[PDB]
């Protein structure tokens, strides 16, 4: 039984690969010669946010494009007014090993999680004036890698126990558990339409999921070792990736295969974060090299570098407005670029 | 006015300094070991679904935070990157166990990890009590798993505890030497292994951790001050 099923699965995999090869009548590099290269993109540190005691692990801009929450391994979430550097809040955490943080799209809540396997929801607007733990979403059997709000009531989270899940915050239950990954799930990106989301795992594969149906739709595998970061192209039909294999990859949902890979032979270190600019023309990735490289998403050539960090660049984000780019590092300083 | 916002920010920064003092005063420790190892008994006997546990204990006016990782996938390729730049890693093994080769492989993986290349390891050769009578009885032979023990004799620098049968000393020092060779092969001097013959009932575990942390900080400052 097992051998026959393996043969059938291999036949299906061969069919999928043949279909993808047939669809690859052209590659992005040939098409993108029709557009002018972006050229030299230079950004300067407009702000430097300090106050975190230890390594910064995560950060997330608010939809207002001004406030941004940040997390550090010392057990603090600090909300910054990036314009003025004012510390709007400072939330002490139950567990100091926080690996992710999110800002609710409405701006009312922030979430965080880490090696505690619990996604804590914090209410930034309560009549007592303090910041209160609204919910403690428990049920994952591994550390939390990423989380992103869908609504004030729904949040999707990745875990190191190979599962992503969708949570109903009010009831504190898992609406639907996503399974199929074989290794630790390291990051997830929520589509602009909010109906689909894609997560990369410690295996070579990044999988696309449908929250309404609660099941994987397709899988991508064009990576060598381990996917650390993932981001959705602004149009929502493509997503980037970052791996320990020291290269980015651009996939397309409709084509269902790799479109482009961004790497230079002199970059031999893993990628910790990935993000796109507002138009999607620039692909920004943070590396263990202590600096972030700006890639031309179409021409696939480096257009800049953000080297103003003293340690591993662990997180990276771009404002919904597209004005600025934030970055966090293990040196405990966030820096807004532009 | 936005001036009150700056006032709020400065109260926040005052609190951040206040807890920065506490953060810098405390020493963090990572606790590792297999389920056979009695690390749980060690932490429980620290007389001052969820993931990391925490134990707070103090020895001679200096406090420590020890982090025991609980419900997680068997792999630690990623979550051990968080525990970089801790003061020390405490590794606990069941000497009496045979899974000894599994413990050796685990210690190899921890020692050679690229994110823990500067973190000293406080190695607890735990459960000496069981090992002692396991060797004395003779119902099992360590040579079955490590035949090199048949042609091995206790070194000249060994210091057996007051009163000990030669065979138990030989066995315990053979295991300790296995771990020590593992440590030294890749050891470039940037981190050190501090082996200890420990049992969960021993009350010196806190003292041993404190002494090894004192030495680790001594060497860190010595390296900082260009003296090495």
């Amino acid at each position, epitope marked *: 039984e097992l051998d026959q099923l393996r043969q059938e699965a291999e036949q299906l995999k061969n069919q999928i690969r043949d279909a993808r090869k047939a669809c690859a009548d052209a590659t992005l590099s040939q098409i993108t010669n029709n557009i002018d290269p972006v050229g030299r993109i230079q950004m300067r540190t407009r702000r430097t946010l300090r106050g975190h005691l230890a390594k910064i692990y995560a950060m997330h801009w608010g939809t207002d494009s001004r406030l941004l929450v940040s997390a550090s391994q010392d057990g603090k979430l600090i909300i910054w007014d990036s314009y003025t550097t004012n510390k*709007v809040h400072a939330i002490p955490l139950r567990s100091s090993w926080v690996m992710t943080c999110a800002y609710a799209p409405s701006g009312n809540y922030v979430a965080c999680g880490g090696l505690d396997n619990i996604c804590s929801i914090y209410n930034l*607007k309560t*009549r*007592e*004036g303090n910041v209160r733990v609204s919910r403690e979403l428990a049920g994952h059997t591994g550390y939390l890698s990423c989380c992103r709000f869908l609504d004030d009531n729904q949040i999707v989270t990745s875990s190191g126990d190979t599962t992503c899940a969708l949570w109903d915050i009010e009831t504190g239950q898992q609406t639907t558990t996503f399974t199929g990954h074989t290794g630790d799930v390291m990051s997830l990106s929520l589509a602009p339409d909010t109906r689909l989301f894609v997560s990369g795992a410690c295996d070579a594969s990044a999988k696309l999921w449908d929250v309404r149906e609660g099941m994987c739709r397709q899988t991508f595998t064009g990576h060598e070792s381990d996917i650390n970061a993932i981001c959705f192209f602004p149009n929502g039909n493509a997503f980037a990736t970052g791996s320990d294999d020291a290269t980015c990859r651009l996939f397309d949902l409709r084509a269902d295969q790799e479109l482009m890979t961004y790497s230079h032979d002199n970059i031999i270190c893993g990628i910790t974060s990935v993000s796109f600019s507002k138009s999607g023309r620039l692909l920004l990735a943070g590396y263990d090299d202590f600096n972030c490289n700006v890639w031309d998403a179409l021409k696939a050539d480096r257009a800049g570098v953000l080297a103003g960090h003293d340690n591993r660049v662990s997180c990276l984000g771009v404002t919904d407005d597209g004005m600025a780019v934030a970055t966090g590092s293990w040196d405990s300083f966030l820096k807004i670029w532009n | 006015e936005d001036k009150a*916002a700056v*006032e709020r920010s400065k109260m926040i920064e005052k609190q951040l300094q206040k807890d920065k003092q506490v953060y810098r005063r405390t020493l963090r420790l990572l606790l590792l070991g297999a389920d056979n190892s009695g690390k749980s008994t060690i932490v429980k006997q620290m007389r001052i679904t969820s993931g990391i546990f925490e134990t707070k204990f103090q020895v001679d006016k200096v406090n420590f935070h020890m982090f025991d990782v609980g419900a997680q996938r068997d792999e630690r390729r990623k979550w051990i990157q968080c525990f970089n730049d801790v003061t020390a890693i405490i590794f606990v093994v069941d000497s009496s166990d045979n899974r000894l080769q599994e413990a050796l492989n685990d210690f190899d993986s921890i020692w050679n990890n690229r994110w823990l290349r500067t973190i000293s390891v406080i190695l607890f050769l735990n459960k000496q009590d069981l090992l002692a009578e396991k060797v004395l009885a003779g119902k099992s032979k360590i040579e079955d798993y490590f035949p090199e023990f048949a042609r091995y004799t206790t070194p000249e620098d060994a210091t057996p505890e007051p009163g000990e049968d030669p065979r138990v000393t030989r066995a315990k020092y053979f295991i300790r030497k296995e771990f020590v060779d593992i440590s030294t092969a890749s050891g470039d001097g940037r981190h050190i292994c501090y082996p200890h013959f420990t049992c969960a009932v021993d009350t010196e575990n806190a003292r041993r951790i404190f002494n090894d942390c004192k030495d680790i900080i001594l060497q860190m400052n010595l390296r900082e001050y260009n003296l090495v």
Partner: single-chain antibody
Amino acid sequence: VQLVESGGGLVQPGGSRKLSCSASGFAFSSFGMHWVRQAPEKGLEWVAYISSGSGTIYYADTVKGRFTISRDDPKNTLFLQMTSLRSEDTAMYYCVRSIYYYGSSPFDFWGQGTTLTVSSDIVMTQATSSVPVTPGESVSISCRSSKSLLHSNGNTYLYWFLQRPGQSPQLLIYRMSNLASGVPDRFSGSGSGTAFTLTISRLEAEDVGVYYCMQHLLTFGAGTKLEL
């Protein structure tokens, strides 16, 4: 959330008294504190301000030096000593909650207050003292300021208060564009920089009272009343 002021009564002009209020239901430490007096048959007048953490303290020139404000965070008690009193000082004093940060709503809560009876500043004006109206439709209330309240930061520091008969003033709109927490969709506001307008989309009998406009670039307007 509950603020109750204590003290008041009858005091001779040459006497002194200490007004005390107890804060309950919220973190009094993080909330800034303002004192607002409501003299008989006239509008509100700011008295003093103390920042959170006993930091910046301000007094109105009419009461500068004469009064001193004290804060006690651990007891959640606010104190205000009046060394000497004049006849004009008679007024009902409110305990106005306030916290300041990007997106906050200062002056959101007003305490019950106590009546104390005794035996350059920015000037603003309102279009009319009274405006007869009926429920089920909208009306417009406007006010003017001596100088543009639009600071270089890109926002106007003005607030609107509603004082129902026998009830403390309530914050309707802050910064001319943001509705308070809990206020219904019955209110809206707009302006150009020097003249602002408060528009009630649909009036109801439960909102009877007098409207005050205040700027925080603290002085209040003459007050506009709605006659149903």
